[PDB]
Design a protein around this ligand. Structure first.
Ligand SMILES: [Mg+2]
Ligand SMILES: [Mg+2]
Length: 76
């Protein structure tokens, strides 16, 4: 139970808008995937499978704003 960090909201947003031009706003599973590799982190993939598959409400198999925030709320 936590919330993203302000300064961290901008940092990620900047990288999001840079990697997201389609303007579609939302992103797929692959988009974030790669971004995960570039990010100097080491998160368990097993989780993503559980979350993404347990978060994808739209059922389109794609990540979105809320969907992304929810993943962090639990993960973080
Ligand atoms: Mg996109
Ligand atoms: Mg979705």
């Amino acid at each position: 139970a936590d919330i993203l960090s302000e300064e961290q909201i901008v940092d990620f947003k900047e990288a999001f808008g840079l990697f997201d031009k389609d303007g579609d706003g939302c992103i797929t599973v692959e988009e974030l995937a790669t971004v995960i590799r570039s990010l100097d982190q080491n998160p368990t993939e097993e989780e993503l499978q559980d979350m993404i598959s347990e978060v994808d409400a739209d059922g389109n198999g794609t990540i979105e704003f809320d969907e992304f925030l929810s993943l962090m709320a639990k993960k973080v």
